Amino acid sequence: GDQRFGDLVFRQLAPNVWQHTSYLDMPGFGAVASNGLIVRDGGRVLVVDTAWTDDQTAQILNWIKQEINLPVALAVVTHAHQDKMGGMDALHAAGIATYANALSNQLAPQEGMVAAQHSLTFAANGWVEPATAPNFGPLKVFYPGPGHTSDNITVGIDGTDIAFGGCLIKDSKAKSLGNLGDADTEHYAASARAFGAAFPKASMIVMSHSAPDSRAAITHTARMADKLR
């Protein structure tokens, strides 16, 4: 089911949804995968997360041209770290409208990232303010609270079984929560639980640094996070 295309891997998850995967060598870790999503919505394609690099991100656009052949209407990026935002220039070079949590955009310069063009804001219950998410189609954006980072956001894919936890969620086989360097250890557990509650019927949980898992990934992550506080 995996398709190799250059140094990237693509996996179809549903009739209109694919997972993109890109790799970066990290000392002591070796080659580290990061996953995002590609969604076909009518005559448009919507992207969740860049690849680690601009060149890899341009390859996502090339793959889309070959396999889907619809224009990319927008991309949303799920926090200000390299695996999610490292390829912003490739999107901007291509004239693609980009969106991130306002806070991600504010942190981007400190994090060595290029800010997205547009900022999302959120209600007190975590749901995106819809005026700030123009023509997002099936992408349903939820801010679960601080966890992996202060700015981390999540995305449900309406009309499918899929929700995307980004780097907040790890799979049920994980022994750790990954990079906690920028994490909120007090609030991480509640944020993970809030993600689950926000998308209560998603059965396929996609995440940045594990292959897709069932809903146990959410609970297992929350329980690991309980031990941080």
Say whether residue 49 binds its own copies (CB under 8 A).
no
Say whether residue 206 binds its own copies (CB under 8 A).
no
Query: Which of positions 37-96 make contact with Zn ion (CB under 5 A)?
Result: 81, 83
Token readout for 80 is 């200000």
Q: List the x/- string, 93-122, binding to its own copies by CB under 8 A.
A: ---------xx-xxx--x----x---x-xx
22-40: burial string, b at 16+ Cβ within 10 Å, e else: bbbeeeeeeebebbbbbbb
3-state class (DSSP) for residue 113: coil
- Distance, in Å, from the CA atom of 173 to the CA atom of 164, rounded to the nearest integer, reads 17
Token readout for 46 is 């919507």
Token readout for 58 is 């341009």
Among its own copies, Zn ion, none, partner that 106 touches (CB below 5 to 8 angstroms by kind): its own copies
Among Zn ion, its own copies, none, partner that 126 touches (CB below 5 to 8 angstroms by kind): its own copies
State residue 204 phi and psi, 5-degree precision.
Answer: -115, 110
Among Zn ion, its own copies, none, partner that 66 touches (CB below 5 to 8 angstroms by kind): none
State residue 138 phi and psi, 5-degree precision.
Answer: -80, -5
Nearest distance from residue 189's CB to its own copies, in Å?
A: 10
Interface with its own copies by CB under 8 A: which residues?
Answer: 102-103, 105-107, 110, 115, 119, 121-126, 129, 143, 145-146, 150, 181-182, 184, 186-187, 190
